[PDB]
Amino acid sequence: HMRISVPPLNTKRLLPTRYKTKNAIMSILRNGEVVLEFLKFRPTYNEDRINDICRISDDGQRIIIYQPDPGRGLPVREQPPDLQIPSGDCVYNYDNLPSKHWKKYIYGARFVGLVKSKTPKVTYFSTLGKCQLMETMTDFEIRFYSGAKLLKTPSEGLKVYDRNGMLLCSESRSLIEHGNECFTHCVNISNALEVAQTKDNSCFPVTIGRRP
Amino acid sequence: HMRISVPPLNTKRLLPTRYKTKNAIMSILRNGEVVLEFLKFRPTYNEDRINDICRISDDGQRIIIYQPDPGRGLPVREQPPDLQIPSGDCVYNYDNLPSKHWKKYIYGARFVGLVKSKTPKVTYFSTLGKCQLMETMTDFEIRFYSGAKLLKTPSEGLKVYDRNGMLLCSESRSLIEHGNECFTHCVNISNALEVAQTKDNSCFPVTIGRRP
Numbered sequence A, B: 001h002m003r004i005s006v007p008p009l010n011t012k013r014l015l016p017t018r019y020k021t022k023n024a025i026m027s028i029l030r031n032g033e034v035v036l037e038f039l040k041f042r043p044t045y046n047e048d049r050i051n052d053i054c055r056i057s058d059d060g061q062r063i064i065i066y067q068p069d070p071g072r073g074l075p076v077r078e079q080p081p082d083l084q085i086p087s088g089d090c091v092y093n094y095d096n097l098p099s100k101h102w103k104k105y106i107y108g109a110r111f112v113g114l115v116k117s118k119t120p121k122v123t124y125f126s127t128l129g130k131c132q133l134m135e136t137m138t139d140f141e142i143r144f145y146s147g148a149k150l151l152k153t154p155s156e157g158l159k160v161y162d163r164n165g166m167l168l169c170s171e172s173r174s175l176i177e178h179g180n181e182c183f184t185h186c187v188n189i190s191n192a193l194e195v196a197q198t199k200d201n202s203c204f205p206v207t208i209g210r211r212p
Helices: A099-117 A172-193 B099-117 B172-193
Strands: A017-020 A024-028 A034-042 A047-056 A062-066 A091-093 A120-125 A129-134 A140-144 A149-152 A206-208 B017-020 B024-028 B034-042 B047-056 B062-066 B091-093 B120-125 B129-134 B140-144 B149-152 B206-208
Touching: A017 A099, A024 A099, A034 A099, A047 A099, A062 A099, A120 A172, A129 A172, A140 A172, A149 A172, A172 A206, A172 B172, B017 B099, B024 B099, B034 B099, B047 B099, B062 B099, B120 B172, B129 B172, B140 B172, B149 B172, B172 B206
Parallel strands: A120 A206, B120 B206
Antiparallel strands: A017 A024, A024 A034, A034 A047, A047 A062, A062 A091, A120 A129, A129 A140, A140 A149, A206 B206, B017 B024, B024 B034, B034 B047, B047 B062, B062 B091, B120 B129, B129 B140, B140 B149
16 A cells, blocks of 8 residues: 655666765665665764665665674775675565665665766757756756756756856747757657667667767 | 659768769768769860769759850869859759759769768667668678677678688677677667657767767
């Protein structure tokens, strides 16, 4: 009757990264794996200590959740620890992950979504600039030849800047019109290319045409 | 009952060029126009002289065929003459071009086809190299990371070269297999992208993915 807030995450055309924050270290590895190292400063060591580790496969299906050196934690090295044969207590999959853990998997999904938002899926060179539709399919930016730039998120909204940055008309609603016209073309093509996609071959990321 | 050998030519994503030969000067202009300047050396001027001009629109539909300065001809300048208001004797379109002219239009079509063959439509970065499917849709070349290269035309056939160039097996039929696998992917995508294509927006040329 009750399911988890977010659908299973995925690394598709996502590059290896490592984002550091004040509560966890989130990492995407070459195998496409997601590794979250949650943090708690314990005075016993007088520094930040990994408190829990959450690991998710490259398709959000397989999950490992544990809390190493229970009560002492770990030294933050540059990269997360390597995968050791998991207990099986701490092994779950998406369709069974107990509610008490959902929040962490959610952290991972939010992270992957963020990297999804900063990752180009489609690049269109229009007659006015460089369209770039991200892997989130809801983020979009245009880099006009003139120097104007347009941004679009499903959250912060719209922020068209001219050569100096203005919001406000005449110049704007020309730009905006192009923006959406460009946006339709990029989503339309992502959807068009989903057809030619196989398991062994990839269609994205993709760059289309050039400037004059 | 009888039609012309070739279907109407077209400049799609074709760049401005000028190919020189021993009988004509073929040119593709920015407007997408095709201009053939046929040649005859007349001793009267003791040099090559344009004998006839053939001009074809960017969709092989509209044709202009004439023979300037009848009996004397023209000095070969760097570019063809500009379009003057045509007589209308020398104005035709595809569906009426009289047989006596077909051969020239054919020259133009062959030229445009040649440039079509040297023009990239799709670029795939596979796991083994750089696939490149030309605008002819029958020409294809792979540039493997190793240094092997594969070629394919509908005419001269097949010529797979290794790091030194060999034909002949073991290494070959690995390569060839990839070649066709790559080839299927590129044609499949051109056809997939034909759907997202509009009049105001373009889908080609296109480059897909990167190397590791």
